[PDB]
Every structure is written in structure tokens, then in C-alpha cells.
Amino acid sequence: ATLATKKATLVAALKDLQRVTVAFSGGIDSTLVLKMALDVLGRDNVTAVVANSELFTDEEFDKAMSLAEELGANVQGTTLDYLSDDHIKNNTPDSWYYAKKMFYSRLNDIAANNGSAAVLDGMIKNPGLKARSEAGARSLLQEADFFKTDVRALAQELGLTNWNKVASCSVSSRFPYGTTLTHDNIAQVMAAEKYLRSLGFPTVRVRFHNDIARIELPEARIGDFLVFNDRVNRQLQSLGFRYVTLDLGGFR
Amino acid sequence: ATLATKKATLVAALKDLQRVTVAFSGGIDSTLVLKMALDVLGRDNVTAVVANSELFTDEEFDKAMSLAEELGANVQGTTLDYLSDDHIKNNTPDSWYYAKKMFYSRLNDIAANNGSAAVLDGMIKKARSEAGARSLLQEADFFKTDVRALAQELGLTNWNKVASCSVSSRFPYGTTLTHDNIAQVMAAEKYLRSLGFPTVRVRFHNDIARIELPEARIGDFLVFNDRVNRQLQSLGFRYVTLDLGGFRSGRMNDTLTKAQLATFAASW
Amino acid sequence: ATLATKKATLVAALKDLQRVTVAFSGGIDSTLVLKMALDVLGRDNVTAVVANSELFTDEEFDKAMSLAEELGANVQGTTLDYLSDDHIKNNTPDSWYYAKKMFYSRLNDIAANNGSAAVLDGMIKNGLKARSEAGARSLLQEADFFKTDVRALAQELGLTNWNKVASCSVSSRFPYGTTLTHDNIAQVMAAEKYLRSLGFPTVRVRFHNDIARIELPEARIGDFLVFNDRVNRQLQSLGFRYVTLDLGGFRSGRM
Amino acid sequence: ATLATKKATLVAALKDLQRVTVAFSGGIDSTLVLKMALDVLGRDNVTAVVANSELFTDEEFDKAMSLAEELGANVQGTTLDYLSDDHIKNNTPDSWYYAKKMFYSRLNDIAANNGSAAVLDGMIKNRSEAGARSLLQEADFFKTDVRALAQELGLTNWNKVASCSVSSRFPYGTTLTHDNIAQVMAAEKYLRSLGFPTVRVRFHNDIARIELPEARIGDFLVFNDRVNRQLQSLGFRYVTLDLGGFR
Amino acid sequence: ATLATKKATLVAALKDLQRVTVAFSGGIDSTLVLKMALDVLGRDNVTAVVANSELFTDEEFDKAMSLAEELGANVQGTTLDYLSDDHIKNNTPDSWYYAKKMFYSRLNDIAANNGSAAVLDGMIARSLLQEADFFKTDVRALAQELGLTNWNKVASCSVSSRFPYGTTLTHDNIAQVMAAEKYLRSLGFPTVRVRFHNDIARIELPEARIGDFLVFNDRVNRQLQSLGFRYVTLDLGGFR
Amino acid sequence: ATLATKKATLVAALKDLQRVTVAFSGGIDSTLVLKMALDVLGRDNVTAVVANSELFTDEEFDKAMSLAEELGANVQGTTLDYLSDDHIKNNTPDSWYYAKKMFYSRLNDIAANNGSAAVLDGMIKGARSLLQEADFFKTDVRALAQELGLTNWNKVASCSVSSRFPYGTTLTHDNIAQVMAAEKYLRSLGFPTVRVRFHNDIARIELPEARIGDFLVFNDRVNRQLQSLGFRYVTLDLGGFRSGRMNDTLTKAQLATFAASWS
Numbered sequence A: 001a002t003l004a005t006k007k008a009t010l011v012a013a014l015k016d017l018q019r020v021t022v023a024f025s026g027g028i029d030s031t032l033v034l035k036m037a038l039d040v041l042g043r044d045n046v047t048a049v050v051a052n053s054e055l056f057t058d059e060e061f062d063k064a065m066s067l068a069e070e071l072g073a074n075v076q077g078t079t080l081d082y083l084s085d086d087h088i089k090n091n092t093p094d095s096w097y098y099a100k101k102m103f104y105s106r107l108n109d110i111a112a113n114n115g116s117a118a119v120l121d122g123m124i125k126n127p128g129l130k131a132r133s134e135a136g137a138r139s140l141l142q143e144a145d146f147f148k149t150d151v152r153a154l155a156q157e158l159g160l161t162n163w164n165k166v167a168s169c170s171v172s173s174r175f176p177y178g179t180t181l182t183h184d185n186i187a188q189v190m191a192a193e194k195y196l197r198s199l200g201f202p203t204v205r206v207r208f209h210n211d212i213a214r215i216e217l218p219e220a221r222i223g224d225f226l227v228f229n230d231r232v233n234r235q236l237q238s239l240g241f242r243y244v245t246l247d248l249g250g251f252r
Numbered sequence B: 001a002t003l004a005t006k007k008a009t010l011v012a013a014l015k016d017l018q019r020v021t022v023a024f025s026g027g028i029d030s031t032l033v034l035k036m037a038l039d040v041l042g043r044d045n046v047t048a049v050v051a052n053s054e055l056f057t058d059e060e061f062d063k064a065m066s067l068a069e070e071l072g073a074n075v076q077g078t079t080l081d082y083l084s085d086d087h088i089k090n091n092t093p094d095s096w097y098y099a100k101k102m103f104y105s106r107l108n109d110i111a112a113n114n115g116s117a118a119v120l121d122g123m124i125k126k127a128r129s130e131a132g133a134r135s136l137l138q139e140a141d142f143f144k145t146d147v148r149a150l151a152q153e154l155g156l157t158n159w160n161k162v163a164s165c166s167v168s169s170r171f172p173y174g175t176t177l178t179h180d181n182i183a184q185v186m187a188a189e190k191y192l193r194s195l196g197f198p199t200v201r202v203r204f205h206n207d208i209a210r211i212e213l214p215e216a217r218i219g220d221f222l223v224f225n226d227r228v229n230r231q232l233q234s235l236g237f238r239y240v241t242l243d244l245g246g247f248r249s250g251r252m253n254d255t256l257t258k259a260q261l262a263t264f265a266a267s268w
Numbered sequence C: 001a002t003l004a005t006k007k008a009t010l011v012a013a014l015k016d017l018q019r020v021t022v023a024f025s026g027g028i029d030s031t032l033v034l035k036m037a038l039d040v041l042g043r044d045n046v047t048a049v050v051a052n053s054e055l056f057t058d059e060e061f062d063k064a065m066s067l068a069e070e071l072g073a074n075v076q077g078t079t080l081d082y083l084s085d086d087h088i089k090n091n092t093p094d095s096w097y098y099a100k101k102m103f104y105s106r107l108n109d110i111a112a113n114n115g116s117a118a119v120l121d122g123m124i125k126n127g128l129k130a131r132s133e134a135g136a137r138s139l140l141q142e143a144d145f146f147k148t149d150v151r152a153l154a155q156e157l158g159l160t161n162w163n164k165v166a167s168c169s170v171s172s173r174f175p176y177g178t179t180l181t182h183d184n185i186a187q188v189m190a191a192e193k194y195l196r197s198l199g200f201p202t203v204r205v206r207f208h209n210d211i212a213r214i215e216l217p218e219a220r221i222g223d224f225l226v227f228n229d230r231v232n233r234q235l236q237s238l239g240f241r242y243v244t245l246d247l248g249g250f251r252s253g254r255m
Numbered sequence D: 001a002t003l004a005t006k007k008a009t010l011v012a013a014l015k016d017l018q019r020v021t022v023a024f025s026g027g028i029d030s031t032l033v034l035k036m037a038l039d040v041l042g043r044d045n046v047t048a049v050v051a052n053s054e055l056f057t058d059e060e061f062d063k064a065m066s067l068a069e070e071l072g073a074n075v076q077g078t079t080l081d082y083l084s085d086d087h088i089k090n091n092t093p094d095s096w097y098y099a100k101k102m103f104y105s106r107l108n109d110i111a112a113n114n115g116s117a118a119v120l121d122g123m124i125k126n127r128s129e130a131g132a133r134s135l136l137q138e139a140d141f142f143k144t145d146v147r148a149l150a151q152e153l154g155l156t157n158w159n160k161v162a163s164c165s166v167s168s169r170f171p172y173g174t175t176l177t178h179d180n181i182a183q184v185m186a187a188e189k190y191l192r193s194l195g196f197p198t199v200r201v202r203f204h205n206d207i208a209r210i211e212l213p214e215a216r217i218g219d220f221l222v223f224n225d226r227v228n229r230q231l232q233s234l235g236f237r238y239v240t241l242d243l244g245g246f247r
Numbered sequence E: 001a002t003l004a005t006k007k008a009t010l011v012a013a014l015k016d017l018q019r020v021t022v023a024f025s026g027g028i029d030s031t032l033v034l035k036m037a038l039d040v041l042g043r044d045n046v047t048a049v050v051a052n053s054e055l056f057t058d059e060e061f062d063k064a065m066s067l068a069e070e071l072g073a074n075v076q077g078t079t080l081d082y083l084s085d086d087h088i089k090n091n092t093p094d095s096w097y098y099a100k101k102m103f104y105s106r107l108n109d110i111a112a113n114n115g116s117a118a119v120l121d122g123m124i125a126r127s128l129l130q131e132a133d134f135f136k137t138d139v140r141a142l143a144q145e146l147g148l149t150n151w152n153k154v155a156s157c158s159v160s161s162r163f164p165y166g167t168t169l170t171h172d173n174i175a176q177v178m179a180a181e182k183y184l185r186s187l188g189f190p191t192v193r194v195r196f197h198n199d200i201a202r203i204e205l206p207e208a209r210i211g212d213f214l215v216f217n218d219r220v221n222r223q224l225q226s227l228g229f230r231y232v233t234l235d236l237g238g239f240r
Numbered sequence F: 001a002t003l004a005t006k007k008a009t010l011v012a013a014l015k016d017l018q019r020v021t022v023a024f025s026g027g028i029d030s031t032l033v034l035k036m037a038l039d040v041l042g043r044d045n046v047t048a049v050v051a052n053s054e055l056f057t058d059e060e061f062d063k064a065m066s067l068a069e070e071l072g073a074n075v076q077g078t079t080l081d082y083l084s085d086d087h088i089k090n091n092t093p094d095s096w097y098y099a100k101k102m103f104y105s106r107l108n109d110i111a112a113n114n115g116s117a118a119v120l121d122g123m124i125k126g127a128r129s130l131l132q133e134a135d136f137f138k139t140d141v142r143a144l145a146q147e148l149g150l151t152n153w154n155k156v157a158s159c160s161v162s163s164r165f166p167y168g169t170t171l172t173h174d175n176i177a178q179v180m181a182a183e184k185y186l187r188s189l190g191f192p193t194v195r196v197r198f199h200n201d202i203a204r205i206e207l208p209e210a211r212i213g214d215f216l217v218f219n220d221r222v223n224r225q226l227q228s229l230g231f232r233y234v235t236l237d238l239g240g241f242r243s244g245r246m247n248d249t250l251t252k253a254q255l256a257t258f259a260a261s262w263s
């Protein structure tokens, strides 16, 4: 029941596996898995893998690569071509599952090639985990009954203080279901959001409605936002939008 | 030349025509034509026609009807079905012309049936030329200042100060107008006007409403965001948005970014 | 004295003059003078004159020209070169008087050339030496019109339209002793014209050399925020180095 | 039906009366009635009356007195004693009835003494007083007809925003006093001078609860601290803004 | 006063006390005392006590309970019945004294019963952080140095301050104020007071946030009316 | 390349020096240098110096003094008389160099007297800037600072008050105090990043643009406060603090032209 029993379950699971490939995103969870894997198995027995793709930003990729490096892991980036799957390309309500399918298939290929006994990810005890289970990836924190409070507890005891505090969210969510994602309109959404964040709005969505951008901001930020209206209008128009709008309902 | 000669040209054209039908909107221009026609020819020699349609509000029609009655004209309301023309229903870039054609075709029928010698409208300084409609203020070289001068001299003080625009302008070209989405746009704009924003547009982008406000009002508007969101969603929009460029985008920008906004708008 | 008596005095004075030139600004006072002149003497015996100059906006000039025509007057624009007078150019407390002198001197020339018996202005009762020295007549003042009598006769004549936002000389944007130049005048005039175009009809761009100090009514400053960057860049393109908003609001100083 | 017909009804009614006393408030409605009475009957057959009282601002009284002269009327100010009636002083939902009673009783006394055939007020269509003729209402004037006829007569000057009876700033069952009335009156006068012509300072003893039109609240923030200190110096302990806005 | 001297001063003081009960609120300060006490004395010689009561939010109790368990302490919740004291119930200007009395009496009773030598708190009943001359900045230095990243960042105050002196506190009106403030915080205003004036709610916000609040005026008016206020108002003077 | 190589370059340089004096301002950069020196060389081999002057707020001098001791350094404050140099006093465009010149002369005097092999400062991307030598950019400073557990540094970054005065304006104790008091007042209202630029009878306030909407409630109090400090007109710069950094690409280019026109 205690953290010590949970940690022990995690330690013994790693020792049994001996050589692992870690799906590393930079979150606290996969940071904890990667640190435990390094401490239990040694740097030559752990491969940290960070996936680059069109649905996530270069900034989050670069941050994860640097964090794995900082922890002392051998880290390798791999590029996924999500738009090659028609379910993802056409953004069906099922697209998340096919992206997860391609993700775990790639990490399995890497693990098969480096002699790893398993792919590990950072899933915990809190569905969407269908793709992981189908590929055989192990969520050791979940197996060891780690809740979020235990992750923080163990991180503190191990002296981990550095991880990515901004949880990534697939850009697919900026597009209505049935809308076709392209290299161009994905980049236009990410470039628009990057500009808005640089203005001091870290929580933002630029929702894509063909010629319309619909900006979602937390409502308590909209009053301050007004000073930027025209600069935002023209910037996002130079990115290719015809109309730049603010959702009166706010973020979500 | 002088105002006096311009009036005399207008009087002489009316005297020659003897019996006229006047396209009356309630604006100052058609108010001047109707007042002049009544003064020169008499009530029994004038028919004022006010057209109702789906592209304009019943409030504007009712005001124009009441204004024509106030002048003492025999008034005839007529209803146009603009949506029966596929150019108008599908909102093509030439949709305005087919509306003009259908408008002047109805007025010609009314004038032919009541023995008028011409249809008159209030245009100043075209489906009208093909229809044979006469714009006597334009023929007599009246500019807007001459209209105002003659109106004041005739003692005309009551007219439509707000020239309202066809609801067609709220729909992108190629979007099909329907009875429901017209009513949706009209009710949304009416609600926003009732909140204290008399200059407003609710542009229709299917499930998105894109609200245009004069930019100096956007700060005041924030207090109403949630009520406007839920109101326009109850009218049938899924998403309710405020255009960051405001109403008449670019007209208030600095020189450089006004040119930039026009370079963008002309790329589209 | 009743309003009818004040009107009859004014009517008799116009009748005696037969033909007049009216200095017309578009304000309610000169609108009343012009309308009465038109009613008593007829449009052919009245010339309305609107003076254009560097110290007042083209918008107020254009409005006054349109208003005089809407009243039914023959109207003539005339341009004064105020900056040719060193008193006006050096922006001293007597500059206004020398401007009035050049104003009425021009109006006298117009009146002599069209056969008018007098120049009329819109002054009423409550710096008029230049008017008196020039022999210009203020018939509203002569007939004991106060501002309430002006409103009453305007109502009786059906006058409802005039310029309610009376313009003041751009010289007030410069501290005393600052030399007015064509360049710095145009800089201030263009800055204020832009700000009015944003929806702020009451505004001052105070000139502090490389600093512009914008005065707005305090109840409007919240509305202004959406325009900060465009106003900043617009006014720098007009030549200012720094574009600022006075926290004290419209006419914050005066002291 | 037409404006001209309603005007003609008004003209005929005035002609029949020959001599009237006009309850004049300075609003557009009583401005139109007063001007029509003067135009049909002449200055010597019209008496304009402006009622001053503790429940309406001295500023509106002064404006109306000046406007009545501007319209061409002989004008008489009269001061009403609303707080001398216990029904009004104790501020019940029936207070309105007793104030109207005293108002029309005074105007009727004035009219009896100058030989008027009636007291006229500015009530319009869209509620009847028996002791006064509301000729605009009898002639079926709507607010739109008042404005159209006003423009046609060249009337442009009237009180555009009536402050209305200060009794509405106090809860029912609260006793009105000269002190608390004065406190509310001075508070609203200050807020109006800042550029908010439509405002209420609702009285909750040590709390002031300010009602502004909601579209004005964003502009108001620049004044928060000055209003707070001013209304505290007038005697409120806490100065607040109602989040619901005006009404 | 190097960090090493201040830490060593505290280390020696804890070591001398052998067995401790920690008044733990979830703030960074009591978080520091608890972590240090556990490290110096061991888990089985430290009991963290978090007080539940009507004058503080259930959210703050749950977070502090969770945070202390997260650090590895044996944690014990205790319930104080503040409203049973007539001074607290009637909200006298002296009520604060009687509240502290029951709090330290309860913690003293807990400590005597489990063999603790003292009750410790996190003030910067002994405050060893205060004795070691800890400022807020050096507390921060040790927190990172010990790997501490989680604590209660918004230290609450007693709900009594929302009522004028002499007002009777009730279960209903406390719940009403507490619910109103929870709603306003959920909108993005972590520093707020809903001051209780019978049928009037008077909201205090930091003055620099009042402009941001306007978008919420109508929802807040109607929300707090459904909680029982007749009028919902914003204090023009701001928070305090 | 990697953060570890950069740290190792820094470690090797400190070991080589053996005894150092650290110019410590309280910024994250000089905090990183000081912590590294202490960890590599030991407390008895490092002296932290915080320079006070008429151009530095006493509050920032105190904060740096407290942070250096907090890190475990022997720390010594010293005051420079910048206003005794006519180039600094009359605020010429070269004032920056003469202030830095007098700064480094004082630190060199201290290092010669304490047996230090060099003076170290926190310069990044005979004074040594070891962070710059080891190729540290701002991202690497933040990353290493996090790794050592550094949590305290001056987040509201000190600049010389001279930057509030136009070139050619004479700095005095009175007008410096006027600027410092105006800025301290604004910080007390909740605006930690602020400049009160001095234009004789005009104060021109620079705020981050995302805060200007919040400022409206304080307009009258700030106007009256700064007038009592001696300004005639109290104004807000419409371009804000660090004008241009947040603009769209076109207008950022435009404002970069405007700024360059006054250089």
C-alpha cells in the first residue's frame, strides 16, 4: 500500500526485464520511469525514445530530447508520419487510436532492433489504452499502482525536480471531425498558437475552421488581450487565415 | 448650376410625366421625390410603392409605410420573393443586379396597371435603365447637399436616418440563403442592437457567427460575452465569435498596416 | 424685452443693411445670423463666408461649408495665412487678436468686392477690439441676444442642425513661446485627425517636441487600449519619437 | 393614425380648453405639450409650473425653469412638501399614490387660482390621473410620435435623462430622512459629473450600492478610487458597484 | 547566517527533541518542518496533524492531508469544533485568541497521548524555522535542495474575517460565503473575499484584477444570488 | 554541446583559477557563477562582491547581499561613486563604458588584496566571464541553475537607473531619487516590471503591454503621486516596455526603423 511497496514492485519489474526502451515525453511520469530504469539497469541497457511528428511541436520534441540527455540517458529521436494514415489524415473520431497504433508499432520496431525486452511508457493509475495493450507496451507505474501523488512522492525522494510542466495536446483537436489535416494547415495552427503564447497567453487554442481562425482563451485573460487584437488579426492573416476571431465562450 | 434651376428641372420633368409611381424607401432622397411629386401633381396622380422582402426587416418596411402615409400619399405595399431567383438564393457576386431587376420589374407592373407614365426612384449623384425607371434627382444633378437643402426648404424633417443594408451582405458568396438562416442573422443583430450596439453585423459562416463591432466598443462589450454566446447559440449557431478586425476592417489602421490588410483582402 | 422684440430689432437692422456678408463658422450663433439674413434679405443678397486656415481643421471647414449650403445660402470659402503674422507664429497671448485682425480684414475685402453693406459675425452678449476696429457688426449682441435667446429663436426658425463641437486653434497644443511651424502644425493636425477617426471626437495631441502627450476624457481611456499600437506607430510615422497618454486626462494641466 | 391627425386632435383639445396650466418637468413629453399649448393658445393663456421638492434634484428644477422661459412661457416654480405626508416619509409601496395626490392637488390649486380650464401633463400612450388632462395620451401619441413632432417644431433642448424620485434609492420600510436623501443626492450628483448621466446610488445604510448601465461599467474603473473616497466622505462606510447593473 | 548554519541549527534542535508532533497546514513552511523532522527523527517518531474545521475550507484540509502523506509522514486529521466557543460563534474581536486556544489544546492533547516532546509549527509550541532565523527566501532554498516541489500555494485565512464583528456565525452562512469564494476562485481569482452583509455580498478583489473580472459580472451575480444573497456587489476599494 | 560538457568546461576553468572574486549582482547568471565557484573551489577560496552605487537601488543591493550569503559565500559590499566621473554624471552615450571601467577597477583592487587570481562576472552569450567561455546561452544557465537547485535570484532585473535618463541629461541625487521613488511606488501597486523614464517635466511610464489594461484603475493615484515627486505631466508610453518585441512581423520591422532613427 505504501510508496515503498509500490517502488519495490517497480524495481523488481525493471530488474526482471533487464533491457528496456522507454517512450519518453518529458512529463513527470516518463521522467520517473526513465530515472528508475537508469538507476536499476544502467545507461547501456536503456534507450529513451522521443517521437517527432506533425501533430506535436518541435519545441516539445527539443525539450524532451534535452531532458533525457540531462537525466543521463542515451536518447534517440524517431519521426512518425501520422498523416500517412487516412484515419488520422481525415480526423475521424477514431483517429486517436490509429495514431497510438503507429506510435507503439514504431517503438516496438526500435525495441526489437536494440534487444529490448519491452517498451515502457509513463501511464499511471488514474479506454484509450487499447493501442498500448495491443502492442505489448508495459506501463510499470500503472502495474505498481502509482497514483499521481505517488509519482510526486517518488520524484521528490529521488531528487527529480525538472520535467515538462506543459502537457502536450495533439493538434488534431484544433480541427473539426471530418476535416482533412494537411502539412500546411497544421503548421498554420501551430504558428498561430506559438505567436499567441509569445504574447503571454500560455493557455490557448487556435481552432481551425477553413478560412476562419477561432481563438479560445481563458475568459479572465480576454480583457488584457484587447491590446493585441490588431497585431493578432494581421499576424494570423499573414499565416493564411481570412478571418481571425475570438470565441466568446472562452477556452473549452 | 443653382439649386433653383435644379428644382425647376425636377418640377418640369414631373409636370410632363403627369402620373407617376414612386419607389419609396423612407430615405431622405425618395422622401424628396415623393414630396415633390405630390406637390407638383397632386395625391390622385401619385402612387408610392414600398417593397417588403426577406432581405429587409419588417421594422424598416413598417417605418417606410408610415412615412409615406405621413406625407399624404396613396401608398401600396408589395412583397418581393427575392429567393426565387437562383442568383439571389445562392448569393452570387451579381446577386444585387438580379434583385434590382426583380424590384424594377414589379414596380413597372404596378405602374403599368395604375396608368403611371414612369417609375421614379430616389437615386442621386443598372436594372433601372433596362426597366426605364427615372431617377429625376440624378437627372437634375442633385448631390446629397442639394437634397438636404431642398428637403429643409420644403420643411421635410422626418425620414430614415439609418439606411439599412440587404441581409445578403451577412452571407459569404456562394452560401445559400434560406428563410431560417436569414431569420437567424436578423434576430442575432436585433439582440445585439438591443444591448446598446447600434452598428453591428452578424456574419453567417454556417455553424459560426462572426460578430463585427466598431473597435472602440469591444472593451465595453466584454460584460455581455457570455449572454451573447448563449443567446446566439440558442438561435442555432454552434460557435459565437468576435472578429478581431472589427467592423469595416482596416479603415482605422495606421497607413502601413492598412495597406497590409488590403494586400491580404485582395489576395482573397 | 421679449424674444419678439429682439427678433424685430434684428429684422430691422438686416432690412436697413440690404446686402450682407456673413462670417459663418457652423456654430449655432452664426447659423442664426445666416438664417435670419436669408429670411429677411433673400438668398441673392447674402454671401456666407467660411475661413479656412492652418490653425483649424479641414473637417470643420468642410462641415461649415456644407451647413451653409444646406441652409440655402450662397457660400464662399476663403483661406487665411495666419502664420504670415509674427504674433501668431510666435504663439503669444495676443496672437488671437492678430488672427482676428487678418480674419476681419479679409472679410472686409470680400464685402467690398460683392457690394455688401456690412460684415456680420455671430457674437452675442454675456477680445472684440479687432471686430470693432474693422467695423464688423454683431447684430445678435446689438439686439441683446443671450445664449438662451439664441436657442429660442433657433427653435422658432426650425434650426436643428449646427456644429455642436466647436473647434479651437491648434496653437493651444503648443506651450507659449514655442514657434509654430508648418511642419509641427501638420504633425499635430494629422495626429488629432487620426485619433478622431478612431472614435474619440474630443482629443488633444499636446506637442512636447519629440514627445506627443495625448489627452483624452478619462471616461474614454479604457476604450482606447485596442488602439495603443496603431496610435503609437501612426504618430511616430508623423515624426514623434515617443507617443504617450496623459494619465490626468483631457485638459489635465492648464497649470 | 398619422402624426398630422394626432397633432390636429391635440390642437382641437387645446382650443376647446382656451386656458391651461401645464405641469412642466423639462422632459421631451412635457416640453412638447408646453410648446403646443403656447403655439395654439399664446403666452398669456398658458402657465407653466415646475414643481421643486426634496425627492427630485435641484438641478432638474433649475433646468426646467430655464427651459420653460426658453419655450416662451410664463413660468412659476412651486415647492412640494412630500415628506410632510407620513405615507411618503415611511416609504411604503403606496408612497407613490400619496405623492401623486399632493402633486396634482398643488397644481389644481394653482390652476383654480389663475382661471385655467385644466391642468395638463405630459403622459403619453404605452396610468390616468383624473385631475389632469394627458392630451398626448388622449391623442394616442407614442414616444415615436413625440420625437417626430418635436423635431418638426424644432425642439432640440430638453432634459434627456430624468433622475426620477429619490425614494426609489431606499428600501421599502425604510424611513426617509433629510440627511439620507441629501447623502444619496450628493453621491449621484458626483457620479453624474464624472460623465455617467444614468446612475443610482442605492442606500443600504452603511453600504452604497451603485447601479450603472452595464455597457458603462468598463469605462467606470478609472474612477473607482475617487468614487470610493468621495462617497465615504459623504458618510458611507463601504462603496460598492452592483454586478447586475442598472435596473 | 549561511543556509548551512540555519539548517544545522534546526537539525540540532529537532535531534534534541527526539519525538515530535507537527502542526501541518500544507504551507511551504510547515512542509519544510515536516520534511526536516522526518529526515532527522525518522517516520515512526513524527506525527503530522492537520486540523479540520468549519472556519477553513475542506479543500485545504484534503490537500494538506495528501501533501503530508506524500512526504512520507504518518498523518492524523483532527476535527475542531470552533463554533462551540461563544467568543468564536459571536465573532468578537477577541475570537482569534480562543480559536488558537482550542487548536493548541487539541494538538497538546494529541502530543501528550503519543509521547511527543513538543508541538511544532511552521511560523517563520515552538517554530524552529523562526528560531533558526529562516526568511521566506531561505525556506525556498532548502525546499528545492530537499527536492520539495509540492505545497499549498494559496494560504487561506479564517472565514471569520468575512463577517463583521458581533455577527453570529452559522453553519449556513459560513457555507454560503465559502461556496461563493470557491466559485470566484474557480474563475481565475485566487485572492478574493466575499464579505457577508446579510442580504448583500460585497466582493473584494485586488484592484489590478477588477478589469479582468467584468466578463464574469452576470454569472457571478446570478451564482451568488442562487447561494442566497439578494444583492451581489463589488467593493470599489478593492481587496483590503 | 551538451550541458554536461559546458559544466565540465566551467569546472575545469575554476579549478585552474584556485582563488576567485565574483562580481555578484543577484541575477541568475552571477548566481550560477557564484554557486559553481563555491562548489568547485570551496568557501575559503571565493569572495562575492556586490557593488552599490548611486545608480543601484539599495533594495537590490540588499537582496544580492542576502542571496550571496544564502548560497554560503563570504560576501562583501562596496560602493562606487559613479557621479564623480563627468562622463557618467552628464550621461553621455559612452557613460556605460566609464561606469564599467570604474566597476572593474574596484573589483580588481579587491582581488589583488584578497589573493584572487581573477575577477569573475556573469556575462553570457582583466575580468573573466567563464559562462561565456564555456558557451553558455540563457537556456543553459536556466538548465544548470535548475540542476543545482538554485531557486532565488533577482527576477525583477536590476538595470542602472541611468537608462531612465536621456543622453545629455545631468544625473543628480534629486532626480535619481525621483525616478527611483516613482518606480518603487509603481511596483508597490503590483507592477514589478516598470520604467519611469525621465523627461524633465514629463514622466513617461513603460509597462509590459499585457499589464496596461490593468493599470487604468491606478491612473489618478499615479498621476498625483508622481506629480508630488516633482513631475509636471505623468504619461504612459503607448508602445509599452520593450516596444516591438511582441509585434507582428511587419510592425516589429517598422518600430525597429523608428528606434534606429534616433540612434
Ligand SMILES: CC(C)(COP(=O)(O)OP(=O)(O)OC[C@H]1O[C@@H](n2cnc3c(N)ncnc32)[C@H](O)[C@@H]1OP(=O)(O)O)[C@@H](O)C(=O)NCCC(=O)NCCS
Binding pocket: A022, A023, A024, A025, A026, A027, A028, A029, A030, A031, A049, A050, A051, A052, A056, A096, A097, A099, A100, A103, A120, A121, A122, A123, A128, A168, A170
Ligand atoms: C499515448 C498517446 C496515444 C496519447 O494518450 P495520452 O494518454 O493523452 O498521452 P500522454 O501525452 O499523457 O502520454 C502518456 C505517455 O506516453 C508516452 N509519450 C507520449 N508522447 C510521447 C512522445 N512524443 N515520445 C515518447 N513517448 C511519448 C510517455 O511515456 C508519456 O508519459 P508522460 O507524458 O506522462 O510522461 C500518444 O502517444 C499518441 O501517439 N497520440 C495521441 C493520441 C491521443 O490524443 N489520444 C487521446 C487519448 S483517448
Ligand SMILES: CC(C)(COP(=O)(O)OP(=O)(O)OC[C@H]1O[C@@H](n2cnc3c(N)ncnc32)[C@H](O)[C@@H]1OP(=O)(O)O)[C@@H](O)C(=O)NCCC(=O)NCCS
Binding pocket: B023, B024, B025, B026, B027, B028, B029, B030, B031, B049, B050, B051, B052, B095, B096, B097, B099, B100, B101, B102, B103, B104, B120, B121, B122, B123, B166, B168
Ligand atoms: C435599389 C436597389 C435596386 C439596389 O440599388 P441601390 O441603388 O444601391 O439601393 P438603394 O437602397 O440606394 O435604393 C435607392 C432607391 O431605391 C428605392 N428603394 C429602395 N428600397 C426600397 C424599398 N424597400 N421599397 C421601395 N423603394 C425602395 C428608393 O427610391 C431608394 O431611395 P432612397 O435613397 O430614398 O432610399 C434595391 O431596391 C433592390 O431591388 N435590391 C437591393 C439588393 C442590393 O444589395 N443592391 C446593391 C446595389 S450595388
Ligand SMILES: CC(C)(COP(=O)(O)OP(=O)(O)OC[C@H]1O[C@@H](n2cnc3c(N)ncnc32)[C@H](O)[C@@H]1OP(=O)(O)O)[C@@H](O)C(=O)NCCC(=O)NCCS
Binding pocket: C022, C023, C024, C025, C026, C027, C028, C029, C030, C031, C049, C050, C051, C052, C053, C056, C057, C060, C061, C096, C099, C100, C103, C120, C121, C122, C123, C127, C167
Ligand atoms: C470671431 C473671431 C474673430 C475670434 O473671436 P471668438 O469669439 O473668440 O471666436 P469664435 O470661435 O467664438 O467665433 C465667433 C464667430 O466668428 C465667426 N467665425 C469664427 N470662425 C469662423 C470661420 N472659420 N469662418 C467664418 N466665420 C468664422 C462666426 O461668426 C463665429 O460665430 P459662432 O461660431 O458662435 O457661430 C474669429 O473669426 C477668429 O479669430 N478666427 C476664426 C476661426 C478660423 O480662423 N478658422 C476656422 C475655425 S473652425
Ligand SMILES: CC(C)(COP(=O)(O)OP(=O)(O)OC[C@H]1O[C@@H](n2cnc3c(N)ncnc32)[C@H](O)[C@@H]1OP(=O)(O)O)[C@@H](O)C(=O)NCCC(=O)NCCS
Binding pocket: D022, D023, D024, D025, D026, D027, D028, D029, D030, D031, D049, D050, D051, D052, D056, D095, D096, D099, D100, D103, D104, D120, D121, D122, D123, D162, D165, D167
Ligand atoms: C408625475 C408624478 C405625479 C408621478 O407620475 P409619473 O408618471 O411617475 O412621472 P413622470 O416623470 O412620468 O411624469 C409625467 C409628467 O408629469 C409632469 N411632471 C413630473 N414631474 C414634474 C415636476 N417636477 N414638475 C412639473 N411637472 C412634473 C410632467 O408633465 C411629466 O412629463 P414628462 O416628464 O414626460 O415631460 C410625479 O411628479 C410625483 O409627484 N411623484 C412621483 C413619485 C413616485 O414614486 N411615482 C411612482 C409612479 S411610477
Ligand SMILES: CC(C)(COP(=O)(O)OP(=O)(O)OC[C@H]1O[C@@H](n2cnc3c(N)ncnc32)[C@H](O)[C@@H]1OP(=O)(O)O)[C@@H](O)C(=O)NCCC(=O)NCCS
Binding pocket: E022, E023, E024, E025, E026, E027, E028, E029, E030, E031, E049, E050, E051, E052, E056, E096, E097, E099, E100, E103, E104, E120, E121, E122, E123, E124, E155, E158
Ligand atoms: C496557527 C493558528 C492558531 C493561528 O496562527 P496564524 O499565524 O494566524 O496562522 P498560520 O496559517 O500562519 O499558522 C502557522 C502554523 O500553524 C500550523 N497550522 C495552521 N493551520 C493548521 C491546520 N489547519 N492544521 C495543522 N497545522 C496548522 C502550521 O504549522 C502553520 O505553518 P504555515 O501555515 O506557515 O505552514 C491557526 O491555525 C488557528 O488554529 N486559528 C487561527 C486563529 C486566527 O484566526 N488568528 C488571527 C490572527 S490575529
Ligand SMILES: CC(C)(COP(=O)(O)OP(=O)(O)OC[C@H]1O[C@@H](n2cnc3c(N)ncnc32)[C@H](O)[C@@H]1OP(=O)(O)O)[C@@H](O)C(=O)NCCC(=O)NCCS
Binding pocket: F022, F023, F024, F025, F026, F027, F028, F029, F030, F031, F049, F050, F051, F052, F056, F095, F096, F097, F099, F100, F103, F120, F121, F122, F123, F159, F160
Ligand atoms: C556591470 C555593468 C557594466 C552592467 O553591464 P553588463 O555586464 O552588460 O550587465 P549584466 O546585466 O549582463 O550583468 C553582468 C554581470 O556583471 C556583474 N554585475 C553587474 N552589476 C553588478 C553590481 N552592481 N554588483 C556586482 N556585480 C555586478 C554580475 O556578475 C552580473 O551578472 P548578472 O547577469 O547576474 O547581472 C554595471 O555594473 C554598470 O556599471 N552599469 C550598468 C549599465 C551600463 O551602462 N552597462 C554598460 C556595460 S554593457
